[PDB]
Design a binder for this molecule. Structure first.
Ligand SMILES: NC(=O)C1=CN([C@@H]2O[C@H](COP(=O)(O)OP(=O)(O)OC[C@H]3O[C@@H](n4cnc5c(N)ncnc54)[C@H](O)[C@@H]3O)[C@@H](O)[C@H]2O)C=CC1
Ligand SMILES: NC(=O)C1=CN([C@@H]2O[C@H](COP(=O)(O)OP(=O)(O)OC[C@H]3O[C@@H](n4cnc5c(N)ncnc54)[C@H](O)[C@@H]3O)[C@@H](O)[C@H]2O)C=CC1
Ligand SMILES: NC(=O)C1=CN([C@@H]2O[C@H](COP(=O)(O)OP(=O)(O)OC[C@H]3O[C@@H](n4cnc5c(N)ncnc54)[C@H](O)[C@@H]3O)[C@@H](O)[C@H]2O)C=CC1
Ligand SMILES: NC(=O)C1=CN([C@@H]2O[C@H](COP(=O)(O)OP(=O)(O)OC[C@H]3O[C@@H](n4cnc5c(N)ncnc54)[C@H](O)[C@@H]3O)[C@@H](O)[C@H]2O)C=CC1
Ligand SMILES: C[C@@H](Sc1nc(-c2ccc(Cl)c(Cl)c2)c(C#N)c(=O)[nH]1)C(=O)Nc1ccc(S(N)(=O)=O)cc1
Ligand SMILES: C[C@@H](Sc1nc(-c2ccc(Cl)c(Cl)c2)c(C#N)c(=O)[nH]1)C(=O)Nc1ccc(S(N)(=O)=O)cc1
Ligand SMILES: C[C@@H](Sc1nc(-c2ccc(Cl)c(Cl)c2)c(C#N)c(=O)[nH]1)C(=O)Nc1ccc(S(N)(=O)=O)cc1
Lengths: 326, 331, 331, 331
């Protein structure tokens, strides 16, 4: 018989449906950073990669597979066909392009193909949307998939808040893990730094320093949030794109989802009902993440100005959204 | 009183050196895969990055920094100037030209040797007690070059070598046998390149010799053509390069595997590029992979593999080929 | 208008079924060491503890829970009633009675049978599809007992067997050679404890066979007395018990390693106790350790190790002894 | 030659000191919990254990060693003689007496002072530059004793203090809110144990102050009696002890978390016991818990929490009480 059969006696020939499977759709810079970060955190027992560029997709799969000895994810697969994504617990969408409106429409056209395919093979997965513009595309994925809002999550301001805490820790000489602060609302340009919640060891910086984040602030802490916004552009300008930070951010979200941790993360969720907002829009607020996606959200007390900014974002997003062609 | 002063009382200042600093030279596809892997393995308390392309360097540094919340490495720095690398315990060199589709790693010698002539003395100046881990291709030749230029004892000059080839081999073995690569044991030695040598005589699962079970294993007569598995290992980089343009993730993980053994003084055995003079009647100062014990002083010991007459001939051929190249280098 | 409602808006209250649940039955030193190791390796999303000693049980649960901030297992439960164990992927049995001075093997085994007669039906009731991992001694016999009572297929009943014996062997081997145990390979098979069998032919570093280098290895003509390494594997277990009263840490770590392969579907090879009828020469329903492929279905395959005449005879004798005892048991 | 010499060619003999060494003094339930958690977090390249009970010490050491295959800490040692602790970066003291029937609390305190009178000089002798982490109770008093005896600067003497109390508080908060403790923020400061102070103003999720949302929080008029949460923090300490006889897992995990920040120079903030003279009107040499930045040189900075008059008066009362005891201790 074969060497295998001489070496190994078989008790039974499998095979179970995937138990802890994650799919990443789009193997560009962001998708692959998510993939490697998820692999090194041992979050999945099966990883599937999808893309439309077939040679790239195969080469990325093979590169990862060659590192199998150093990982604890025993099955890595890829394909243009969504059959490879069947029974995923979590499906991460990083596909797309990176004026504006026509760009949104290009990514919407992409989602019109991707989302139905995802749902067909994993009708009960959680969807985590990373593609930009992320808040708008999370709404698009929600409408197309027909999923309940708990199962559709935008990476949203998780990255923005990580940047903010990195910058805060640099200023204070404290690890980011111990520097707490929340950036909410729209990802990117219009995000909102919640000054009232910035604290170390529960000590409110705003209470110590009333001018915190105002124009008159002798220390111009507002510049920290300015950097949060601008640093996103600077990284793209410097290396051409961003990958590592978003990959790590996404793996953190995936960790709460896959392990049912119920930690709180600022991610994009359907916010209709809050802050005078009455349109189907997705904005980041702090959400409890677990095996059922977003099960709960924190109602952050916002100032008048902060609420106004979220409202303005909602209006803008809805304005774009009600013109999109599905 | 500033906000910081209101919030935090300082007991004492003055800086201290990092305990476990790693530098990566070259922030291209390979350097950054090494960086992320090392970061996610929590091996370093400081990571330094160096490159000659200043915008790319700063951008890569910043991208990693923005991921700090999710890491356990509190300081990430970068610069074109090697002062950013001072006091490194381990310095990983990934800079230089890579082989294009259909090009041999051996075609990169002039380019990369010349780059090493600038890099290595700079590294040594700022971290005279570091271990050097060479990744740039052709890796065996460049380990020899790094060793010669640095003036380090050879224990502290390590080539990533066949750790990756052996990983690939065990991956493919595991796919054939239906076993995780961790449980499939098999060694690929010699050149990290076309002349590498699969040690059929040592392949096993649970200590059961595959060659004993299957005498034709690895030969031309083999009905299961296991030699094709080694051919796949040889061709793997070329195939991945044809498909995605370069290789990155597997070598990044391989390097982090080696870094872990060194930084944590594990004394695990890995096939890495080192001087093999004195083994198998080889008299030249040739570098290529054999199994080595890796720890805090780098390579402390070599494991002497018993090769068949056929395996030993192939290894000697690999050594002959590589020494033909090394010997013509001028320093 | 409770603080919770002011603070948190609930989107839905649904389902909430554990996806990666593990139960430990028995919270003595072994059970709790398995528990802490499993927690620190992030293997489970829910951990359940069962024992008949209620105060001890609640105390252990609370002590683990108070450490929740430092763990990534969000739900830890306990109870004397098996409803707490519902929907476990893996159920680890460390419960049983300790042998009394002068008590016969049969009397001790029978008491454990009687204990398993209460435990196993309750486990099966609540997790009909779980894998069972038996740790309780005598482990080879009690693995058989759990298989008989549960009615589970062979693949889902696993004895920790010689997993710990082999880890001890590799520690001792590593110490002699100055190599990390990860890189020292060697297999102790058959009966856990006194009658275990060291497979000298498989002992190697980097695929280099120690027996081939040193043909007297393991014999009485061996001037280096490598046989003493296996004698230490056997004696070290008793020595630890005499010194600290019990063993806990090493068994905890070994069980966590098995749980990792099972929970993550790794298909790594481990030396564990499995129903060995029809193989290695044996015709009775007995469980002994051989290298087994472990993953999400428990033991899906096993490795057929080539044994010397002596090694084979030792396994056969163990099988004869085990069946001699088992055939007298009252179920 | 020997088998070892046939198998392995040595390049280097010269060994080097362990570079990230941790010692645990006292191998009771607390000490061994600290040990296993530190081992499973890969914080140390060498672990030393010290106790006065020789058989127990050796057995614990061996049990850990036997688990080496599953660990990344290549050297574990033990001894009654403190030479085994030489060159430790961090030394964790969990050694203590047990109060006896009829014994006064002050008498028990002095018996632990007498224990430290022997331990601390020995630790200082072999690791004059280490950080001391005091866990032994009464922890705040004994941290002062260790500081006084050692002559170390305040940054290198750290009491476990309210690290555990705070972890318990966050666990309980998390249960009430249905949120992971990692995302539930709240600080218990001052004295470890009975007289600890829950800082209501700092309790939050996502930076949303519970005290602002719910002004009655932490008062007797609290319709939800959140004060009961802190009551459970103190009460649960006694309940675990009553139920299982001692506490181990939670303290061990909390100590490993502190060790992680120190060994990896993270500069995270933890509630630990430190010299507070000069704060809150306190003018005596007393150690109480406040949030401290922990890194390579121990406590480099502390956070100056804004406290209510009532909260400030509790710490002052605690300091007066502790000083009154300390001035009467016999050194
Ligand atoms: N939410 C956030 O914080 C961040 C979001 N991003 C976004 O992530 C997206 C990707 O970024 P990059 O990876 O740098 O772009 P990229 O161009 O390198 O990769 C995109 C990949 O999507 C693939 N793709 C295109 N159409 C597809 C389809 N119909 N099905 C499957 N795959 C398809 C492309 O072939 C390409 O490989 C962009 O939208 C970018 O703006 C980037 C950084 C941060
Ligand atoms: N040992 C192994 O198994 C593998 C080795 N490699 C080798 O690694 C090397 C790098 O590959 P990639 O990162 O894909 O190339 P890359 O082109 O993406 O990056 C190379 C980087 O080296 C930098 N560099 C060039 N000269 C420099 C100097 N004097 N100082 C500092 N930096 C300098 C470049 O600016 C560039 O950023 C190649 O030689 C490649 O063949 C690649 C894969 C595997
Ligand atoms: N397979 C191996 O390599 C090793 C196996 N062991 C075995 O593991 C077993 C446990 O060891 P220890 O924890 O030290 O003993 P232990 O006596 O400290 O703990 C046993 C626990 O089982 C509980 N128990 C008894 N009857 C029960 C029932 N009907 N249901 C639930 N729980 C019950 C006891 O109350 C006790 O808490 C022993 O049989 C020991 O020999 C120990 C070391 C190694
Ligand atoms: N700070 C905290 O949050 C907590 C502190 N603790 C304290 O930790 C200490 C230890 O707790 P357990 O491990 O349960 O006590 P234990 O009595 O079980 O173990 C104490 C060990 O200290 C050893 N020891 C006594 N004198 C010694 C000496 N001169 N040199 C070396 N070792 C010596 C004993 O021999 C014994 O092995 C106690 O003081 C306890 O109160 C306990 C729980 C929490
Ligand atoms: C900081 C830039 S960096 C950046 N931005 C974009 C981007 C974002 C939004 C739009 Cl509308 C367009 Cl056209 C491009 C792309 C891309 N692609 C990219 O690769 N990088 C960014 O992400 N801006 C941003 C603005 C609004 C939204 S939202 N609230 O409408 O969802 C999302 C993102
Ligand atoms: C090394 C001791 S340490 C030890 N051994 C025992 C033990 C083991 C077997 C028997 Cl038959 C008895 Cl009566 C006691 C107990 C217990 N209880 C204990 O607490 N510690 C041991 O586990 N021996 C052992 C012998 C035979 C078997 S088997 N092949 O029959 O399953 C399993 C183990
Ligand atoms: C909740 C008990 S649980 C407990 N408490 C004690 C204990 C604590 C304090 C004293 Cl003064 C005495 Cl005599 C015993 C022991 C012990 N041993 C034990 O094993 N468990 C506790 O730890 N109390 C405690 C009180 C005061 C201090 S302080 N601020 O004066 O240092 C520290 C701890």
């Amino acid at each position: 018989a074969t060497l295998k059969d001489q070496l190994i006696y078989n008790l039974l020939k499998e095979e179970q449906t995937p138990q802890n499977k994650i799919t990443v759709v789009g193997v560009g810079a962001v998708g692959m950073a998510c993939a490697i970060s998820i692999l090194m955190k041992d979050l999945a027992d099966e990883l599937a990669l999808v893309d439309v560029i077939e040679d790239k997709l195969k080469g990325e799969m093979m590169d990862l597979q060659h590192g199998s000895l150093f990982l604890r994810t025993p099955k890595i697969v890829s394909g243009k066909d969504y059959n490879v994504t069947a029974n995923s617990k979590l499906v991460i969408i990083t596909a797309g392009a990176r004026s504006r409106l026509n760009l949104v429409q290009r990514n919407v056209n992409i989602f019109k193909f991707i989302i139905p395919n995802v749902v067909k093979y994993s009708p009960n997965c959680k969807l985590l949307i990373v593609s930009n513009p992320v808040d708008i595309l999370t709404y698009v994925a929600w409408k197309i998939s027909g999923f309940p809002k708990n199962r559709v999550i935008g990476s949203g301001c998780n990255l923005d808040s990580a940047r903010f805490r990195y910058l805060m820790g640099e200023r204070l000489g404290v690890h980011p893990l111990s520097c707490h602060g929340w950036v909410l609302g729209e990802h990117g340009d219009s995000s909102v730094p919640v000054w009232s919640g910035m604290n170390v060891a529960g000590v409110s910086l705003k209470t110590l320093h009333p001018d915190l984040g105002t124009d008159k602030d002798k220390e111009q802490w507002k510049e920290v949030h300015k950097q949060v916004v601008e640093s996103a552009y600077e990284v793209i300008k410097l290396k051409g794109y961003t990958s590592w930070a978003i990959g790590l951010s996404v793996a953190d979200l995936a960790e709460s989802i896959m392990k049912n941790l119920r930690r709180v993360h600022p991610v994009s969720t359907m916010i209709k009902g809050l802050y005078g907002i009455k349109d189907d829009v997705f904005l980041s607020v702090p959400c409890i993440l677990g095996q059922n996606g977003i099960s709960d959200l924190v109602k952050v007390t916002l100032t008048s100005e902060e609420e106004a900014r979220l409202k303005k974002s909602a209006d803008t997003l809805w304005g774009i959204q009600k013109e999109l062609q599905f």
